[PDB]
Amino acid sequence: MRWRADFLSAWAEALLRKAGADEPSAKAVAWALVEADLRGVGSHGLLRLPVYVRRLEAGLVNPSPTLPLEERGPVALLDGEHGFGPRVALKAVEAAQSLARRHGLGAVGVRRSTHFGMAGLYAEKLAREGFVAWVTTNAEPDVVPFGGREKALGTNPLAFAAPAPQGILVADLATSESAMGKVFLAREKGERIPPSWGVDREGSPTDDPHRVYALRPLGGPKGYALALLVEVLSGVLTGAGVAHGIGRMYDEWDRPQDVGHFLLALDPGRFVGKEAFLERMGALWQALKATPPAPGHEEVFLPGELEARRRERALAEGMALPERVVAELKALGERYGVPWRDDA
Amino acid sequence: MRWRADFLSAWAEALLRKAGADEPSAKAVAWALVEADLRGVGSHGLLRLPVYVRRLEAGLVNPSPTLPLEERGPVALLDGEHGFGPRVALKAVEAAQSLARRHGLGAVGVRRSTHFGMAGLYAEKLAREGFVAWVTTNAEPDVVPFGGREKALGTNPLAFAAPAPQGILVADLATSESAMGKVFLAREKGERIPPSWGVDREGSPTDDPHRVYALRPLGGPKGYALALLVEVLSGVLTGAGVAHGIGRMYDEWDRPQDVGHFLLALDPGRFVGKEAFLERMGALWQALKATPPAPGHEEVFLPGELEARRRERALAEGMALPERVVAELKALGERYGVPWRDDA
Ligand code: NA
Ligand code: NA
Ligand code: NA
Ligand code: NA
Ligand code: NA
Ligand code: NA
């Protein structure tokens, strides 16, 4: 069962306004979640709308932040004022590209934000402006450090993007084996998960998403190191919450999260040159596509390539949603007087 | 059998001078390789000296580069002129910290360099100057892309570092399951390797380092995406060799490599603040050390922590080297009239 993305986008925005979010915030969230679904990244799509709205309802999210920005040369600090992550992140994107246009590069350290959805969306937006982009965000601890048995770091994802003649190369990855959102998606779809993703409360691997207590770092020490890099850039460096100091969106309803983000935009025009960069990216892209596939693969794909293909398809045939997610969205619609669209 | 690091360092430098390297280049290489050995990273230690010298002998390395540097605000491009990687990289480090001191951040794109050893060494040096550091380098293809069966990308490692009250957090990781240097080390030590690291020429996993044809990306798609990020920053963006365009240090003796590197230094003083940054890093460090260990672990360690401990120990008790490496170094010493030190 597929749904009209444009209708769901309008619906989500309306529900958010009804819940109290101002116009730019409601649009930013509707955009971030639906865009994720379009690309086939359900872990960061409308599946998240219910908890996002509940956080607002509980008074843990700023519905209309001013978003103070302080510039210092090619560096800028953004105060999210506890606004919705997508709203905060989109302003960070604008600030980063503006700084890069003027100085050749721009770094934005964000504090007091909240879960911002798919990191790749922001990196992609920056790349569409002609910049090489690097975007990171920390999160409440859900992952054991390498060699440890208790949660110490968030899934702390990182995203990177760069323009190419063939399209936008976009990488989006949690530094743990898997993002927690994928565990949530499995729960909604009623599916088992790879047992290497996490362990139960007794430290044993489990393929039951409902029994996952903590996640494991990607490839042991390496994913652990990457999680720390993301933590330093997104949290320590910005003035935002750091690891255990970050409020848990799903478990702590006493105060705002204070999630931090880090965004860096680089102008290739200041390096090898804009035209040269694109031609070189094109040759790299071409080379990867020309690589003979491994068994079980029809061809090699660039990060973001399949996502772009899925988006086009979903915009034409509609986007899919798990029955359980729809049921929750319907209940949410009734709670806020913005009924699920029967024409969607 | 352990050896005096100071004696080996002096020996290597002398052999390099004898082979034709100028003073700064010989010192840079001796430094990079021995420092790697001290930290227990033999994959990037003196094990590499023989091939480095052979590259110089064959006329594929500039023994005394001028190292032209072009600054453009917080960005700078460095022409390695085919000099030894460590020599080129050390100048990049100096340029990066200088730019960061003036602008708050500094990015250096390096082209026409060669294998530079352990990336973590450069990130660490930058962090000791008070900066958050990010260092990457591309390399000739040795890794299959996710979904592919032929080599398309180098092990393309990335390193990150940041100062803390307890020490310097330093992450150093190849984006493939393992670095090729670890495969070489296993060969010298006469040990088997994890079969998940690479495949033989027929595409089958092998635990025999002598039969490894291609390596696999870290955790499939994620390591592949990370390798591309490193390739874009180190190669595409800099004007250096890109993937298949990079000369193979071990297999192609017709022309220089043209390896590229990317270095970024961030001044925390321009973000949350220098003092605040250190205190926050200290709390994060403390939290990780306080995490209960998993079975088989005595405690949780920070990236770079064990490496620092090993360095101190090696400086006091001497550094170890595989018998096969020593034998090759001895043959090298005789070839260049700089005999292996019997007092080492
Ligand atoms: Na209420
Ligand atoms: Na009310
Ligand atoms: Na992804
Ligand atoms: Na010769
Ligand atoms: Na000669
Ligand atoms: Na390492």
UniProtKB/TrEMBL annotation, chains A, B:
NAD(+) binds at G117, A119, V170, D172, A174, G304, E307. It comes from Thermus thermophilus (strain ATCC 27634 / DSM 579 / HB8). This is Malate/L-lactate dehydrogenase family protein. One of its GO terms (molecular function) is oxidoreductase activity. InterPro entries: Mal/L-sulf/L-lact_DH-like_ah, Mal/L-sulf/L-lact_DH-like_NADP, Mal/L-sulfo/L-lacto_DH-like_sf, Malate/L-lactate_DH-like. It comes from the Bacteria. Keywords: Nucleotide-binding, Oxidoreductase, Plasmid. Belongs to the LDH2/MDH2 oxidoreductase family. The keyword Oxidoreductase applies.
